[PDB]
Every structure is written in C-alpha cells, then in structure tokens.
Amino acid sequence: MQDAITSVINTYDVQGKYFDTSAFDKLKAYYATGELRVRAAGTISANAATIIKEASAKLFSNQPDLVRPGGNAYTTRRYAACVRDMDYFLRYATYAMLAGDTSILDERVLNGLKETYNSLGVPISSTVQGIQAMKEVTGSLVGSGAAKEMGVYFDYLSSGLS
C-alpha cells in the first residue's frame, strides 16, 4: 500500500530528484489535513457498528427483496456475509482516508472482487448501493468537512465494483 507521502517520495525517486517547492507544498497539504483525518478515523471507528446498522437498514428498506427468500441476502449466513462485507468496505475506506491514497483499496479490496462476486452470485449493483448508504451515513456523522474526504474513497470503491 501507499500513502500520500510515500507517493511523493516514489515520484521524486523515479526521477532521481530532490524535493522542491511542489513536493513540499503537497507534503504540507497532507500534514495540514492530518488532524482532520485522525478525527474522522476516530469518529468512524467508534461508530462502525452504528454506521453498518443504519446503512444496511437503508439498503434493505430500499431493496427488501434481498432479504426475502430468493434474495442474495436471504439466510442468516448470507445476511451475515453481507453486513460483514459492509464492515470490510467501511474499515478499508477508513484506512484509505488515513492514508490519503486509494492504493490499499486496489491492493486489498478490489483485487479480484468483481469476479468473486460474479462467481458467487452477489449483485454488484446492490453492493454499490450499500456502499452509497454507508457514504451517506458516514457523512452525516463525521461532519461536512470530512464528508467529502470520506466520500472520495467510498466513490472509489463504488467505481471499482462498477
């Protein structure tokens, strides 16, 4: 995985160049956003169960057929797997938000997830709407400033599935 700082380091390493004003400016931007990111990560970690409850409730009220017989979330095992996947997305989006890059999202989440759902039979569009529900719930929680920062990585996950 990669952070913003590591990304700048790698870019200036492949050039064999020392840091300049642009690199220092990017590093300052990350350092300035750091405390906001830490506050958002703490708020999300404290309320992960509540966020998952609200988002899954919204998803299964918008799409009730998922949990009635015949739906992909109809069994205790399959419902638990669904809310477990929602936990995955939330935790890894928090990791990415702290990191400042989406590299962890590619490497540790989206690496072969689409074909895994395809073979399992998981409805990708419904999962994307669940991620959207988590985005709305989390934005209502962390605050206006951190909402867009979180929604960047939530949208990255959604676009990775779709």
Partner 1 sequence: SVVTKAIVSADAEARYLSPGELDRIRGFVSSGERRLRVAQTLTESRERIIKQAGDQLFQKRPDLVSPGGNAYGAERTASCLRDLDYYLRLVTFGIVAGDVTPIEEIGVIGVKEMYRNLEVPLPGMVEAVKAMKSVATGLLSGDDSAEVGYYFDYLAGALA
Partner 2 sequence: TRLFKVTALIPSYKKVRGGRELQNTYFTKLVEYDRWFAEQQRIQKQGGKILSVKMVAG
Partner 3 sequence: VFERDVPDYQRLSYPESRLKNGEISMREFIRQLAESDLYRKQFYEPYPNTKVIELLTKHFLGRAPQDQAEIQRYNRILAGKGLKVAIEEVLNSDEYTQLFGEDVVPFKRYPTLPTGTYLASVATNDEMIQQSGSSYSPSYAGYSYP
> Interface residues with partner 2 (CB under 8 A)?
77, 80-81, 84, 88, 106-109, 111-113, 115-116, 119-120
For residue 123, state whether it binds partner 3 (rule: CB under 8 A).
yes
Q: Does 88 bind ligand CYC (CB under 6 A)?
A: yes
Quote helix, strand, coil % in the chain, to nearest 5. 80, 0, 20
CB of 6 to a second copy, least distance (A): 14
Q: Does 15 bind a second copy (CB under 8 A)?
A: yes
Residues 143, 138: Cα–Cα separation, whole Å: 8
Residue type, 12: Y
Judged by CB under 6 A, the residue of 126, 132, 138, 158 near ligand CYC is: 126
Q: Which residue from 158, 43, 159 is spatially nearest to 94, judged by alpha carbons?
A: 43
- State the minimum distance, in angstroms, from the CB of residue 72 to partner 3: 4
What Å distances lie between residue 141 and 1, 12, 84, 119, 124, CA to CA?
27, 37, 20, 35, 26
Question: Which residues within the stretch 19-38 sit at the binding site for partner 1 (CB under 8 A)?
Answer: 19, 24, 27-28, 30-32, 34-35, 37-38
66 binds, among a second copy, partner 1, ligand CYC, none (CB under 5 to 8 A by kind): ligand CYC
* Stretch touching a second copy by CB under 8 A, among 41-49, 53-61, 67-75, 114-122: 67-75
